[PDB]
Amino acid sequence: SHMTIQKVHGREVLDSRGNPTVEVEVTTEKGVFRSAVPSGASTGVYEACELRDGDKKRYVGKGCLQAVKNVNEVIGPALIGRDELKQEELDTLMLRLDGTPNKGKLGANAILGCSMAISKAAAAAKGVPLYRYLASLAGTKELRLPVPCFNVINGGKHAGNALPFQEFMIAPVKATSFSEALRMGSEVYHSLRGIIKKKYGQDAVNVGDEGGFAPPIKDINEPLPILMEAIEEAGHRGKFAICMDCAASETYDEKKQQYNLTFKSPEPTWVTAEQLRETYCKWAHDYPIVSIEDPYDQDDFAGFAGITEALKGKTQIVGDDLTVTNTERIKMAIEKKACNSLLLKINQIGTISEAIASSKLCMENGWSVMVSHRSGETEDTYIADLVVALGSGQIKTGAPCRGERTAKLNQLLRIEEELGAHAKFGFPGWS
Amino acid sequence: SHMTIQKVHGREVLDSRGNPTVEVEVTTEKGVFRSAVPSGASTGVYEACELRDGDKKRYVGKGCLQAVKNVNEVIGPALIGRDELKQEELDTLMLRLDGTPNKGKLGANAILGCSMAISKAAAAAKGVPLYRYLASLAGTKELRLPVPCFNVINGGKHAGNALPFQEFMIAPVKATSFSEALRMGSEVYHSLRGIIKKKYGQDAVNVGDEGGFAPPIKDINEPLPILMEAIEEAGHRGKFAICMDCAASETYDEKKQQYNLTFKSPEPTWVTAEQLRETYCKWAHDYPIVSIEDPYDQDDFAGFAGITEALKGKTQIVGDDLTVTNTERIKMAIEKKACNSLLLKINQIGTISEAIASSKLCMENGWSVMVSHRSGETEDTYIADLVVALGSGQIKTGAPCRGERTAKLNQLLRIEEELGAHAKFGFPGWS
Ligand SMILES: [Zn+2]
Ligand SMILES: [Zn+2]
Ligand SMILES: [Zn+2]
Ligand SMILES: [Zn+2]
Ligand SMILES: [Zn+2]
Ligand SMILES: [Zn+2]
Secondary structure (H helix, E strand, O other), rough: OOOOOOOOEEEEEEEOOOOEEHHHHHHOOOEEEEEOOOEEOOOOOOOOOOOOOOOOOHHHHHOOHHHHHHHHHHHHHHOOOOOOHHHHHHHHHHHHHHHHOOOOOOOOHHHHHHHHHHHHHHHHHHHOOHHHHHHHHHHHOOOOOOOOEEEEEEEEOOOOOOOOOOEEEEEEOOOOOOOHHHHHHHHHHHHHHHHHHHHOOOHOEEEOOOEOOOHHHOOOOOHHHHHHHHHHHHOOOOOEEHHHHOOHHHHHEEOOOOEOOOOOOOOOOOHHHHHHHHHHHHHHHHHOOOEEOOOOOOOOHHHHHHHHOOOOOOEEEEEEOOOOHHHHHHHHHHOOOOOOOOEEEEHHOOOOHHHHHHHHHHHHHOOOOOOHOOEEEEOOOOOHHHHHHHHOEEEEOOOOOOOOHHHHHHHHHHHHHHHHHEEEEOHHHOO | OOOOOEEEEEEEEOOOOOOOEEEEEEEEEOOEEEEEOEOOOOOOOOOOOOOOOOOOOOOHHHHHHHHHHHHHHHHHHOOOOOOOHHHHHHHHHHHHHHOOOOOOOOOOHHHHHHHHHHHHHHHHHOOHHHHHHHHHHOOOOOEEEEOOEEEEEEEOOOOOOOOOOOOEEEEOOOOOOHHHHHHHHHHHHHHHHHHHHHHHHHHHHEOOOOOOOOOOOOOOOHHHHHHHHHHHOOOOOOOOOEEEOOOHHHHHHHHOOOEEOOOOOOOOOOHHHHHHHHHHHHHHOOEEEEEEEEOOOOOOHHHHHHHHHHHHHHEEEEEEOOOOOHHHHHHHHOOOOOOOOOEOOHHHHHOHHHHHHHHHHHHHHEEEEEEEEEOOOOOOOOHHHHHHHHHOEEEEOOOOOOHHHHHHEEEEEEHHHOOOOEEEEHHHHHH
């Protein structure tokens, strides 16, 4: 008993957009283990329930007092005196405590903070770092430092610009260490700021939610030459690839079955799903585009399958809203050959055990896995340890700008230093 | 010996602008205590030396490898086996190890990380939280949660806009708890985003370095009505005051002795020092402006004294570049009655012992103290504990947006919860 969970407590804290979210502390004799839950803006319809208060008098209804009360009054009392090492057992207990398929009773945002903090308490009980403890839970044979995929130019749901597609990313795939990867990323980011300033003016270099630039660009093609120019100017020609997150559901209209690529402008631009495929095949030809995430709407399995086939061996197709880190949706995607990469978001499913199960299922069927932040982040660094623990070789956790992004990148520096010069870096298929 | 410093190690990590900075870990039998050093953009000429590498091939010369090497090869070996409780003794040792008045040999950015991490190791040795341990070092009789002063509209050195003066802040001075203060701040921030979007367009709501908006505004008066409108719209009429940071040295030309309030535009706007005082007296009359920081150039002691006298009892005048958290400059400011508030920046002076000495000297001479971040921050939360430990009742640590800002605000939530319902909140002179 002396080694078990002593206290569990949740509290409402602010995310990087200033919106409330949930943080949980699990206390054992080894210390206080604290985990915070991120929050999406472009959330898939199939994501686990993010439980908000709806009280217009607080945070215009975005409070997390109810989720916090669920931690303090329901989940925490159940956990006291339990063996924190029993991750699957305690995650399953929390699943059953909720009793609903979407975690709509307790909230995925109450459960997840507990699931995370348990695993950190357990790591401390074993006397190993989090990444080591998670690698044991996942059965990972080789740890690796991931290639960071940096969202440096944007165009989605609140960003401050006309740009319709969400993320234009640069990835230092030819770096030979994480230290080198991160420096090169920062250097290109800095070069890009100057390029944007000269082309669009001083007003154009303020940052989006994930620390990238949101220049006054409307057309989805326009960021790409600019990215190649920044890569060149920074002195890293040939070292970089591009990844896209289209978040294409956010532009899609169900009744018309077409995509609006000015949805943030007075006049609409209606474009079809093969007008899209045309664009994607062209992108992949014209630029070193190694990854395209959510190229289509979250239920367009046929669209996804079409582009996955057409770019096989050249450009991975990543499910995010399609798959929502959920073994059931992932099984549908496998059956239809809809995609070949999982965007892994612990808060899309709501427990560590389930997120690990999703990663294992995807890898066993030959997919890559890109561990991901949400557009609403905190100072939490869990995903840095998680990506190394899964050995997946791919992370997206922001531009190299804003503390809720750099905190993960910095944690990756710390892990890299612990693992030493023989630690593997990057994604072998891109190296 | 078993309770002493076991290991000291520094590493280069990224700040919230993606620039390298220094982090230090002090290891004792109680754990690993990690502190990171922030970095200014509008740095005073009298600040302690921030030592950079100047290697154009890394981070276009902004690397911190030399400062890190100074930690690893010089300072750390000196500290091994030492009693971490002896803050003054170890800070003094580091001062003497450097041997120069401006810390130009070892770097203030090598020394400070050590000074910070020592104090956290010592807090753990005593078995008290950091804020408690620092309050004992400072002789503070009453802890308090500070009023947060949120920089929500900007106009300085790289921001992305024409605005010449640096910070337009809102402070929930009539909040009765930190929890309430922080929520109200966030709610006004959200209201302000919508107001800016409607007035200036969707392109106008991307964020600056400290998470405030940088709308396409040129004139220094224009943000103020907008702030009052956001306060009203959020439902907090009467609960808020405004604080300014003019950073007026950044606009000042020495040879002409005048201020350029378009220095970021093609054409210049030359304005004198009494044209300024006119503006400040008007500001203080037209709006609830309770604080104006760096209203004049960093050596204009006469200008500072003039406005300090003219707004006595209504608007505190805060030295930042004038005083650089330095007892010698502070003595000059006292002698001349140049200001009546200290902007406390641990990295302007470079040791905890000296920063505490500055706070104590200012308070003993009747000044307020506003503990501050830098515009380049990290996920470090030291200043949250520091401000509570000094009992000063005033902090500026960003808009309620961006992880390197919200991490401090969140740490303040945690401290408030520990201290309970009877803990004092706010700055009595503003309440
Ligand atoms: Zn024990
Ligand atoms: Zn999304
Ligand atoms: Zn996505
Ligand atoms: Zn001992
Ligand atoms: Zn400054
Ligand atoms: Zn200042």
